[PDB]
Structure 1
Amino acid sequence: SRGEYVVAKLDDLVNWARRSSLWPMTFGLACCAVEMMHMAAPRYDMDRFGVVFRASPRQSDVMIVAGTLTNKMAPALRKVYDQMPEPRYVVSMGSCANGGGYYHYSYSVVRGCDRIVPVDIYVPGCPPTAEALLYGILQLQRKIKREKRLRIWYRR
Protein backbone atom coordinates (compact mmCIF):
# COMPACT_ATOMS: atom_id res chain seq x y z
CA SER A 1 0.00 0.00 0.00
CA ARG A 2 1.06 3.60 -0.58
CA GLY A 3 0.64 4.52 3.08
CA GLU A 4 2.55 1.44 4.19
CA TYR A 5 5.39 2.29 1.80
CA VAL A 6 5.51 5.89 3.01
CA VAL A 7 5.58 4.92 6.68
CA ALA A 8 8.23 2.25 6.03
CA LYS A 9 10.47 4.79 4.29
CA LEU A 10 9.86 7.44 6.95
CA ASP A 11 10.67 5.16 9.87
CA ASP A 12 13.70 3.83 8.03
CA LEU A 13 14.85 7.45 7.77
CA VAL A 14 14.16 8.15 11.44
CA ASN A 15 15.85 4.97 12.66
CA TRP A 16 18.90 5.75 10.52
CA ALA A 17 19.38 9.11 12.23
CA ARG A 18 19.12 7.64 15.73
CA ARG A 19 21.41 4.73 14.86
CA SER A 20 24.04 6.95 13.25
CA SER A 21 23.99 9.63 15.98
CA LEU A 22 24.52 8.09 19.42
CA TRP A 23 25.46 10.40 22.30
CA PRO A 24 26.41 8.50 25.47
CA MET A 25 26.22 10.36 28.76
CA THR A 26 29.53 11.13 30.47
CA PHE A 27 28.88 8.64 33.26
CA GLY A 28 31.39 6.05 34.44
CA LEU A 29 31.50 4.42 37.84
CA ALA A 30 34.44 2.03 38.26
CA CYS A 31 37.25 0.21 36.44
CA CYS A 32 34.93 -0.50 33.50
CA ALA A 33 35.09 3.23 32.73
CA VAL A 34 38.75 2.97 31.71
CA GLU A 35 37.79 0.69 28.83
CA MET A 36 35.27 3.33 27.75
CA MET A 37 38.19 5.76 27.61
CA HIS A 38 40.15 3.24 25.55
CA MET A 39 37.18 2.96 23.19
CA ALA A 40 37.27 6.75 22.89
CA ALA A 41 41.05 6.46 22.32
CA PRO A 42 42.60 6.61 18.83
CA ARG A 43 42.86 2.82 18.47
CA TYR A 44 39.10 2.09 18.48
CA ASP A 45 37.82 5.59 17.81
CA MET A 46 34.13 5.67 18.71
CA ASP A 47 33.79 9.11 17.09
CA ARG A 48 33.99 7.36 13.71
CA PHE A 49 30.58 5.76 14.24
CA GLY A 50 28.83 8.94 15.40
CA VAL A 51 29.19 8.08 19.10
CA VAL A 52 29.98 11.24 21.06
CA PHE A 53 30.03 11.83 24.80
CA ARG A 54 27.78 14.54 26.19
CA ALA A 55 27.98 15.57 29.83
CA SER A 56 24.38 16.65 30.36
CA PRO A 57 21.73 13.91 30.59
CA ARG A 58 19.33 16.13 28.64
CA GLN A 59 21.57 15.75 25.57
CA SER A 60 22.29 12.01 25.74
CA ASP A 61 20.60 9.04 24.07
CA VAL A 62 22.54 6.11 25.57
CA MET A 63 23.43 5.48 29.20
CA ILE A 64 26.42 3.15 29.46
CA VAL A 65 26.29 1.83 33.03
CA ALA A 66 29.96 0.86 33.42
CA GLY A 67 30.87 -0.11 36.95
CA THR A 68 29.50 -1.22 40.28
CA LEU A 69 26.15 0.27 41.26
CA THR A 70 26.01 0.68 45.03
CA ASN A 71 23.01 1.33 47.24
CA LYS A 72 24.27 4.87 47.87
CA MET A 73 24.50 5.45 44.10
CA ALA A 74 21.33 3.81 42.73
CA PRO A 75 19.09 6.89 43.31
CA ALA A 76 21.50 9.09 41.33
CA LEU A 77 21.55 6.61 38.45
CA ARG A 78 17.76 6.47 38.34
CA LYS A 79 17.56 10.27 38.56
CA VAL A 80 19.86 10.85 35.60
CA TYR A 81 18.12 8.10 33.61
CA ASP A 82 14.78 9.81 34.22
CA GLN A 83 16.23 13.17 33.22
CA MET A 84 17.40 11.73 29.88
CA PRO A 85 14.70 12.56 27.29
CA GLU A 86 13.25 9.83 25.07
CA PRO A 87 14.08 7.79 23.04
CA ARG A 88 16.77 6.51 25.41
CA TYR A 89 18.72 3.26 25.64
CA VAL A 90 20.78 1.49 28.28
CA VAL A 91 23.97 -0.52 27.82
CA SER A 92 25.08 -2.31 30.97
CA MET A 93 28.81 -2.99 30.67
CA GLY A 94 30.80 -5.47 32.72
CA SER A 95 29.87 -8.03 35.35
CA CYS A 96 29.13 -5.49 38.10
CA ALA A 97 26.52 -3.73 35.98
CA ASN A 98 25.18 -6.94 34.43
CA GLY A 99 24.66 -9.00 37.56
CA GLY A 100 26.53 -8.52 40.79
CA GLY A 101 30.02 -9.25 39.57
CA TYR A 102 32.71 -9.85 42.15
CA TYR A 103 30.46 -8.05 44.66
CA HIS A 104 27.22 -9.97 44.18
CA TYR A 105 26.95 -11.09 47.81
CA SER A 106 27.56 -7.68 49.32
CA TYR A 107 25.43 -5.54 51.60
CA SER A 108 26.26 -2.36 49.66
CA VAL A 109 25.95 -3.40 46.00
CA VAL A 110 22.85 -3.51 43.79
CA ARG A 111 22.72 -6.90 42.07
CA GLY A 112 22.35 -5.63 38.53
CA CYS A 113 21.47 -2.22 37.15
CA ASP A 114 18.46 -3.89 35.50
CA ARG A 115 16.81 -3.71 38.92
CA ILE A 116 16.91 0.08 38.56
CA VAL A 117 16.71 0.90 34.84
CA PRO A 118 15.45 -0.99 31.75
CA VAL A 119 18.61 -2.31 30.08
CA ASP A 120 18.77 -2.83 26.32
CA ILE A 121 22.25 -4.37 25.86
CA TYR A 122 24.39 -6.47 28.22
CA VAL A 123 28.14 -6.52 27.56
CA PRO A 124 29.96 -9.29 29.49
CA GLY A 125 33.50 -9.13 30.78
CA CYS A 126 35.53 -7.83 33.72
CA PRO A 127 36.22 -5.44 32.09
CA PRO A 128 34.98 -6.00 28.54
CA THR A 129 37.66 -5.14 26.04
CA ALA A 130 37.26 -1.98 23.99
CA GLU A 131 36.41 -4.20 21.02
CA ALA A 132 33.76 -5.96 23.10
CA LEU A 133 32.17 -2.65 24.08
CA LEU A 134 32.32 -1.51 20.45
CA TYR A 135 30.58 -4.72 19.39
CA GLY A 136 27.92 -3.98 21.99
CA ILE A 137 27.45 -0.48 20.57
CA LEU A 138 27.13 -1.89 17.05
CA GLN A 139 24.62 -4.47 18.32
CA LEU A 140 22.63 -1.61 19.86
CA GLN A 141 22.69 0.16 16.50
CA ARG A 142 21.39 -2.96 14.78
CA LYS A 143 18.67 -3.21 17.44
CA ILE A 144 17.61 0.37 16.71
CA LYS A 145 17.54 -0.48 13.00
CA ARG A 146 14.70 -2.96 13.63
CA GLU A 147 12.43 -0.50 15.46
CA LYS A 148 9.18 0.17 13.56
CA ARG A 149 7.30 2.86 15.46
CA LEU A 150 5.57 4.39 12.45
CA ARG A 151 4.85 0.93 11.05
CA ILE A 152 3.21 -0.02 14.34
CA TRP A 153 1.28 3.27 14.45
CA TYR A 154 -0.08 2.93 10.92
CA ARG A 155 -1.54 -0.48 11.81
CA ARG A 156 -2.65 0.84 15.22
Structure 2
Amino acid sequence: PAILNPIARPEVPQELAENIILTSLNDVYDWARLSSLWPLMYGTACCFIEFAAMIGSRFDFDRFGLVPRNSPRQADLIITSGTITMKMAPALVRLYEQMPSPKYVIAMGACTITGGMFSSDSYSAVRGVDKLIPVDVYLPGCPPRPEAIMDAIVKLRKKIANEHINERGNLAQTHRLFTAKHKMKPVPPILTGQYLNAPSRQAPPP
Protein backbone atom coordinates (compact mmCIF):
# COMPACT_ATOMS: atom_id res chain seq x y z
CA PRO A 1 0.00 0.00 0.00
CA ALA A 2 3.00 2.31 -0.57
CA ILE A 3 3.91 1.56 -4.19
CA LEU A 4 0.97 -0.12 -5.89
CA ASN A 5 1.53 -2.64 -8.68
CA PRO A 6 5.17 -2.90 -7.61
CA ILE A 7 8.41 -4.33 -8.96
CA ALA A 8 9.74 -7.44 -7.26
CA ARG A 9 13.46 -6.73 -6.62
CA PRO A 10 15.01 -10.00 -7.92
CA GLU A 11 18.10 -11.81 -6.64
CA VAL A 12 20.64 -14.31 -8.10
CA PRO A 13 20.68 -11.85 -10.93
CA GLN A 14 21.31 -13.44 -14.37
CA GLU A 15 24.86 -14.93 -14.49
CA LEU A 16 25.56 -13.77 -18.03
CA ALA A 17 28.62 -14.92 -19.98
CA GLU A 18 31.50 -12.78 -21.25
CA ASN A 19 33.73 -14.79 -23.61
CA ILE A 20 33.96 -13.51 -27.17
CA ILE A 21 33.69 -16.80 -29.06
CA LEU A 22 30.25 -17.35 -27.54
CA THR A 23 28.92 -13.80 -27.89
CA SER A 24 29.82 -13.60 -31.57
CA LEU A 25 27.96 -16.89 -32.03
CA ASN A 26 25.10 -15.31 -30.08
CA ASP A 27 25.13 -12.45 -32.57
CA VAL A 28 24.88 -14.96 -35.41
CA TYR A 29 22.06 -16.80 -33.58
CA ASP A 30 20.06 -13.62 -33.12
CA TRP A 31 20.82 -12.39 -36.65
CA ALA A 32 19.55 -15.68 -38.03
CA ARG A 33 16.29 -15.74 -36.09
CA LEU A 34 16.05 -11.98 -36.83
CA SER A 35 16.42 -11.66 -40.58
CA SER A 36 14.01 -14.51 -41.38
CA LEU A 37 10.92 -13.85 -39.28
CA TRP A 38 8.13 -15.80 -40.96
CA PRO A 39 4.73 -14.22 -40.16
CA LEU A 40 1.38 -15.90 -39.74
CA MET A 41 -1.38 -14.88 -42.12
CA TYR A 42 -3.80 -13.86 -39.37
CA GLY A 43 -6.50 -11.54 -40.63
CA THR A 44 -9.63 -10.25 -38.96
CA ALA A 45 -10.15 -6.68 -40.21
CA CYS A 46 -8.73 -3.80 -42.29
CA CYS A 47 -5.40 -4.08 -40.51
CA PHE A 48 -5.12 -7.27 -42.55
CA ILE A 49 -5.88 -5.35 -45.73
CA GLU A 50 -3.05 -2.96 -44.92
CA PHE A 51 -0.89 -6.03 -44.25
CA ALA A 52 -1.96 -7.28 -47.68
CA ALA A 53 -0.91 -3.96 -49.21
CA MET A 54 2.33 -4.47 -47.28
CA ILE A 55 2.72 -7.77 -49.15
CA GLY A 56 2.28 -5.91 -52.43
CA SER A 57 4.64 -4.27 -54.89
CA ARG A 58 4.34 -0.61 -53.91
CA PHE A 59 6.40 -1.72 -50.95
CA ASP A 60 6.85 -5.37 -50.09
CA PHE A 61 8.19 -6.85 -46.89
CA ASP A 62 9.70 -9.91 -48.57
CA ARG A 63 12.97 -8.07 -48.01
CA PHE A 64 14.53 -8.23 -44.62
CA GLY A 65 13.32 -11.80 -44.93
CA LEU A 66 9.61 -12.22 -44.24
CA VAL A 67 7.59 -15.04 -45.82
CA PRO A 68 3.83 -14.96 -45.10
CA ARG A 69 3.22 -18.44 -43.73
CA ASN A 70 -0.15 -20.12 -43.38
CA SER A 71 0.26 -22.44 -40.38
CA PRO A 72 1.42 -21.48 -36.86
CA ARG A 73 3.97 -24.23 -36.47
CA GLN A 74 6.27 -23.00 -39.24
CA ALA A 75 5.66 -19.40 -38.17
CA ASP A 76 7.54 -17.00 -35.90
CA LEU A 77 5.28 -13.95 -35.65
CA ILE A 78 1.64 -12.96 -35.23
CA ILE A 79 1.17 -9.45 -36.54
CA THR A 80 -2.17 -9.19 -34.77
CA SER A 81 -4.31 -7.64 -37.48
CA GLY A 82 -7.84 -6.67 -36.53
CA THR A 83 -10.29 -6.60 -33.67
CA ILE A 84 -10.44 -9.50 -31.24
CA THR A 85 -14.02 -10.20 -30.28
CA MET A 86 -14.94 -12.42 -27.35
CA LYS A 87 -15.86 -15.30 -29.71
CA MET A 88 -12.53 -15.49 -31.60
CA ALA A 89 -10.14 -14.90 -28.67
CA PRO A 90 -9.55 -18.60 -27.83
CA ALA A 91 -9.01 -19.00 -31.57
CA LEU A 92 -6.06 -16.60 -31.06
CA VAL A 93 -4.61 -18.06 -27.87
CA ARG A 94 -4.84 -21.47 -29.53
CA LEU A 95 -2.85 -20.05 -32.46
CA TYR A 96 -0.26 -18.30 -30.29
CA GLU A 97 0.38 -21.11 -27.81
CA GLN A 98 0.20 -23.72 -30.60
CA MET A 99 3.49 -22.49 -31.98
CA PRO A 100 7.22 -22.95 -31.31
CA SER A 101 8.56 -21.18 -28.26
CA PRO A 102 10.87 -18.48 -29.72
CA LYS A 103 7.93 -16.51 -31.08
CA TYR A 104 7.07 -12.83 -31.14
CA VAL A 105 4.01 -10.62 -31.49
CA ILE A 106 3.19 -7.28 -33.07
CA ALA A 107 -0.09 -5.53 -32.27
CA MET A 108 -1.05 -3.37 -35.23
CA GLY A 109 -4.10 -1.17 -34.90
CA ALA A 110 -5.87 0.46 -32.02
CA CYS A 111 -8.71 -2.06 -31.95
CA THR A 112 -6.33 -4.65 -30.47
CA ILE A 113 -4.22 -2.80 -27.88
CA THR A 114 -6.98 -0.92 -26.07
CA GLY A 115 -10.06 -1.69 -28.19
CA GLY A 116 -9.71 1.60 -30.05
CA MET A 117 -13.04 3.09 -30.99
CA PHE A 118 -14.62 -0.08 -29.58
CA SER A 119 -12.93 0.55 -26.24
CA SER A 120 -16.26 2.09 -25.14
CA ASP A 121 -19.96 1.20 -25.43
CA SER A 122 -19.04 -2.22 -26.88
CA TYR A 123 -19.95 -5.53 -25.24
CA SER A 124 -18.12 -8.08 -27.41
CA ALA A 125 -14.67 -6.57 -28.05
CA VAL A 126 -11.46 -7.46 -26.24
CA ARG A 127 -10.02 -4.18 -24.99
CA GLY A 128 -6.40 -5.04 -25.61
CA VAL A 129 -4.67 -8.15 -26.88
CA ASP A 130 -2.07 -7.55 -24.15
CA LYS A 131 -4.56 -9.37 -21.88
CA LEU A 132 -4.49 -12.44 -24.11
CA ILE A 133 -0.81 -12.81 -25.07
CA PRO A 134 2.55 -11.09 -24.38
CA VAL A 135 2.65 -8.30 -26.96
CA ASP A 136 6.25 -7.49 -27.84
CA VAL A 137 5.86 -4.35 -29.99
CA TYR A 138 2.98 -1.87 -30.15
CA LEU A 139 2.26 0.36 -33.14
CA PRO A 140 -0.84 2.61 -33.00
CA GLY A 141 -3.37 3.80 -35.54
CA CYS A 142 -6.48 2.45 -37.13
CA PRO A 143 -5.42 1.64 -40.44
CA PRO A 144 -1.76 2.58 -40.05
CA ARG A 145 0.40 3.28 -43.02
CA PRO A 146 1.69 -0.24 -43.79
CA GLU A 147 5.19 1.22 -43.96
CA ALA A 148 4.65 2.01 -40.28
CA ILE A 149 4.43 -1.74 -39.80
CA MET A 150 7.96 -1.84 -41.17
CA ASP A 151 8.90 0.70 -38.51
CA ALA A 152 7.44 -1.74 -36.00
CA ILE A 153 9.47 -4.54 -37.56
CA VAL A 154 12.60 -2.39 -37.38
CA LYS A 155 11.77 -1.84 -33.71
CA LEU A 156 11.17 -5.58 -33.22
CA ARG A 157 14.39 -6.50 -35.01
CA LYS A 158 16.36 -4.25 -32.68
CA LYS A 159 14.73 -6.24 -29.83
CA ILE A 160 15.56 -9.71 -31.14
CA ALA A 161 19.17 -8.54 -31.19
CA ASN A 162 18.66 -7.51 -27.54
CA GLU A 163 18.48 -11.20 -26.51
CA HIS A 164 21.11 -13.61 -25.22
CA ILE A 165 21.71 -17.32 -25.69
CA ASN A 166 22.31 -18.34 -22.06
CA GLU A 167 19.03 -16.58 -21.17
CA ARG A 168 16.46 -18.95 -22.76
CA GLY A 169 15.15 -19.79 -19.28
CA ASN A 170 12.73 -16.88 -19.69
CA LEU A 171 11.10 -18.70 -22.60
CA ALA A 172 9.16 -21.65 -21.08
CA GLN A 173 6.02 -22.02 -18.96
CA THR A 174 5.91 -22.98 -15.29
CA HIS A 175 2.37 -24.43 -15.21
CA ARG A 176 1.25 -23.56 -11.69
CA LEU A 177 -1.71 -25.91 -11.92
CA PHE A 178 -4.49 -27.37 -9.76
CA THR A 179 -7.69 -29.45 -9.90
CA ALA A 180 -11.22 -29.12 -8.54
CA LYS A 181 -14.23 -31.42 -8.60
CA HIS A 182 -17.51 -29.64 -9.30
CA LYS A 183 -21.16 -30.03 -10.30
CA MET A 184 -22.28 -28.00 -13.34
CA LYS A 185 -24.50 -30.39 -15.35
CA PRO A 186 -22.94 -30.73 -18.83
CA VAL A 187 -25.16 -29.86 -21.79
CA PRO A 188 -25.04 -31.33 -25.32
CA PRO A 189 -23.17 -29.48 -28.09
CA ILE A 190 -25.63 -27.48 -30.18
CA LEU A 191 -22.84 -26.70 -32.69
CA THR A 192 -22.60 -29.44 -35.33
CA GLY A 193 -23.35 -29.80 -39.00
CA GLN A 194 -27.05 -30.29 -39.79
CA TYR A 195 -27.86 -27.06 -41.62
CA LEU A 196 -29.89 -28.56 -44.49
CA ASN A 197 -30.22 -32.20 -43.39
CA ALA A 198 -32.04 -31.00 -40.28
CA PRO A 199 -35.69 -32.13 -40.34
CA SER A 200 -37.05 -28.60 -39.88
CA ARG A 201 -35.60 -27.23 -43.14
CA GLN A 202 -37.31 -29.99 -45.15
CA ALA A 203 -40.56 -29.57 -43.22
CA PRO A 204 -43.23 -26.88 -43.39
CA PRO A 205 -44.89 -27.62 -40.02
CA PRO A 206 -48.63 -28.38 -39.71
Please give the range of the TM-score, normalised by the shorter of the 2 chains: over 0.9
Distance 1:151 1:33, change over 3 A: closer
Gaps of 5+ in 2: 1-16, 170-206
| Identical aligned residues as a percent | 49
- For the 8 Å contact 1:122–1:136, the answer to whether it is kept is yes
Cross-structure match for 2:181 = none
Cross-structure match for 1:129 = 145
**3-state SS of the aligned residue for 1:80?**
helix
Letter in 2 for 1:44: F
Structure 2 CA distance for aligned equivalents of residues 151 and 72 of structure 1:
36
- C-alpha displacement at 1:152, in angstroms? 8.1
5 Å-filtered alignment, 1:7-156, equals 7-105=22-120, 106-150=122-166
Higher relative contact order (CA 8 A, sep 6+): 1
Gaps of 5+ in 1: none
Whichever of the two has the greater Rg, that structure is: 2
Cross-structure match for 2:179 = none
- C-alpha displacement at 1:48, in angstroms? 1.1
Structure whose residues are more often helix by fraction: 1
Deviations 1:1-41 (A, max 9, x none): x9611220111010000110010001011111111011111
- C-alpha displacement at 1:150, in angstroms? 2.9
**3-state SS of the aligned residue for 2:19?**
helix
Cross-structure match for 1:4 = 19
Structure 2 CA distance for aligned equivalents of residues 152 and 37 of structure 1:
33
**3-state SS of the aligned residue for 1:141?**
helix
> TM-score with structure 2 length normalisation?
0.71
Distance 1:125 1:10, change over 3 A: same
Aligned pairs, number: 152
Structure 2 CA distance for aligned equivalents of residues 55 and 102 of structure 1:
29
Structure 1 CA distance for aligned equivalents of residues 42 and 164 of structure 2:
29
Structure 1 CA distance for aligned equivalents of residues 40 and 108 of structure 2:
14
